[PDB]
Nucleic acid binder design. Structure first.
Length: 302
RNA sequence: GUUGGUGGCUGCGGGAAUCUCAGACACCUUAAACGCUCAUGGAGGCUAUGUCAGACCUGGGCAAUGGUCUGCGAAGUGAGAAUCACGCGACGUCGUGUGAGGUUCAAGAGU
């Protein structure tokens, strides 16, 4: 019943509270590159990297590392350790991107949920919009920068999600459609889920944005504006796709107890919402393909 | 140089659709296309079809035929505005601070 959910709330920090977010993202990237260089030159362990980070915080040259939140740097070091272990079971550096995130752990109520505000360790009260009601213990907050004027805080909480009631239909055969995104079928009626509106149009706008960026000189101010616009259109495409898939998968979970482009997001959302709401997933051409998928999935399940 | 009817390009409204509002518009019963302003800039920008190859393809090779915009100024470059209500400061505006923003549905995300 207790599920880990990420109440992504749009942050609206002031000038100081966003300067600090920038200086913490840069610091988490810096303490990543520095210790990656140290690890590469070594051929360090968790204790060694923690001690060297503490010395850097006390170092005169890099004293500003202690200004940013400590949990961001600790989790940056943890991510570096995991990446190094995966490469051993020497990854590339971290490049300054538009979309960069840091996460802060929870300790002695350093992070608190306000009405239209969010409390963060070095930031104070950060104004938020669309604060979905939270009734669980905060685990960590992934303060991020989608692009220049867009910040978010994936407040990971342990909120007890309740299982949904009994479902009207027993299965929903879904398969990748040619024209439609997918065709669902309870078994008799073929509800063809058409692709979300203005999806080819927004892909065309994405191509125009990519062409505009490639026409500009890197490191320029107008190049920065075009890069931000490309990031905005990427975020808009992600929002449209994820909203289409959220609505489709919630409709599938509510309407059907079983659910037999962006298909990766579709499958991820379907699986985690099936786990959350108490469902199961078994993992003429379109209609017959969907019917066969439904029949085989139901046979495998039972 | 037009009172009027439909359409969505951009900005805020957390997300999607829709809607107000605002910056521009576009056609005339049609439902498509497009963000805008100023300065600089000086010849290119967009698109359809063909190619495996400019969104270059995989040390080798291809970048063709048309339409469309464009010297009445393209790309690039620098600077700006784009919801509402209260104040504060300075000359009806400009900054600056705070607050609010409709309906339905939805909302785990990240290296």
């Amino acid at each position: 019943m207790i599920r880990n959910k990420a109440f992504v709330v749009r942050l609206y920090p002031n000038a100081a509270q966003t300067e600090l977010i920038n200086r913490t993202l840069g610091s988490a990237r810096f303490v990543y590159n520095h210790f990656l260089a140290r690890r590469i030159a070594a051929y360090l362990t968790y204790g060694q990297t923690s001690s060297e980070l503490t010395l850097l915080k006390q170092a005169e040259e890099t004293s500003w590392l202690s200004e940013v939140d400590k949990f961001a740097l600790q989790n940056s070091l943890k991510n570096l350790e995991t990446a190094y272990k995966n490469f051993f079971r020497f990854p590339r550096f971290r490049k300054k991107r538009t979309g960069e995130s840091y996460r802060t752990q929870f300790t002695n109520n350093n992070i608190q949920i306000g009405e239209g505000r969010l409390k963060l360790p070095k930031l104070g009260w950060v104004k938020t919009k669309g604060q979905q009601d939270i009734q669980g213990k905060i685990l960590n907050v992934t303060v991020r920068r989608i692009h220049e004027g867009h910040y978010e805080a994936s407040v990971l909480c342990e909120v007890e999600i309740p299982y949904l009631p009994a479902a009207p239909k027993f299965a929903a055969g879904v398969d990748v459609g040619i024209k439609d995104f997918a065709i669902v079928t309870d078994g008799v009626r073929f509800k063809h889920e058409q692709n979300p509106k203005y999806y080819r149009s927004t892909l065309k706008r994405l191509r125009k944005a990519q062409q505009t960026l490639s026409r500009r000189k890197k490191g320029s101010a107008r190049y920065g504006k075009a890069k931000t616009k490309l990031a905005r259109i990427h975020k808009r495409i992600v929002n449209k796709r994820q909203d289409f898939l959220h609505k489709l998968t919630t409709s599938l979970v509510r309407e059907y107890e079983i659910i037999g482009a962006g298909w990766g997001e579709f499958i991820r959302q379907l699986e985690y919402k099936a786990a959350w709401y108490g469902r199961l997933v078994s993992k003429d051409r379109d209609e017959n393909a969907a019917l066969n998928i439904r029949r085989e999935a139901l046979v495998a399940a039972g």
